[PDB]
């Protein structure tokens with residue numbers, strides 16, 4: 001039973017696979033042991049809460065977590081903090097009002113400037129479509145995912161401010177490749193003049209690229225993803241996707257572990273209500 005535990009989401013999303021690897025490799029530099037668990041893609045809020053409670057009961061020094069929802073891990077995170085575990089919030093911000101009410105805190109929150117992500121993707125699309133612009137659509141993450149919402153707002157605002165761009169559709173595909181395919185299929189059907197998709201992540205971007213291929217419209221309709229997973233990078237090189245706004249999940253993981261280990265060294269968990277340490281990891285546009 002390692003010194004530290006991490007709870008990540010489905011390894012069916014290479015984003016979480018790369019964050020896992022990043023964490024293992026940092027652990028090797030720091031010389032600490034980590035146990036890493038991934039929630040099944042179909043696992044419900046309750047089932048992640050039970051895992052965290054169960055990890056909380058073992059002899060872990062700290063737990064880092066990417067929560068299924070802003071609220072689902074409030075009570076178990078508050079109970080781990082109460083026990084004096086060093087807690088780090090990865091990717092998606094836990095509801096800090098509800099965490100306060102529950103008498104808990106976390107040491108730190110490690111994430112990407114996700115407004116900037118969405119803006120970067122939209123700005124790339126606006127610059128690419130040039131003077132004539134045209135109709136664009138957004139394939140959203142799961143409802144209530146703050147990081148997805150940030151990308152949606154960032155992109156939407158960029159599109160709004162460009163007079164030559166009309167956002168014709170904005171619909172969730174819940175981080176799921178197959179749902180993204182089905183949704184993108186229907187959008188194309190309803191908008192024969194569609195020029196581009198922005199997609200809040202790469203599993204959805206890859207579904208959307210398949211929908212564009214199905215309609216025989218590769219190169220004709222732009223597809224911009226987010227995360228920079230290998231298969232999306234491959235698609236970009238091959239010209240099946242236009243671009244992706246790369247995150248660095250390996251760095252989000254490494255930085256989160258380091259924050260948890262550093263916190264532990266002081267021998268004091270962060271006091272309640274005190275704003276956790278905030279660490280931003282860069283994003284970059286990748287194109288062909």
Ligand SMILES: O[C@@H]1[C@H](O)[C@H](O)CO[C@H]1O
Nearest residue numbers: 015091092147175201227
């Ligand atoms: O930032 C992460 C990644 O974009 C993942 O692909 C979907 O969930 C988001 O919160």
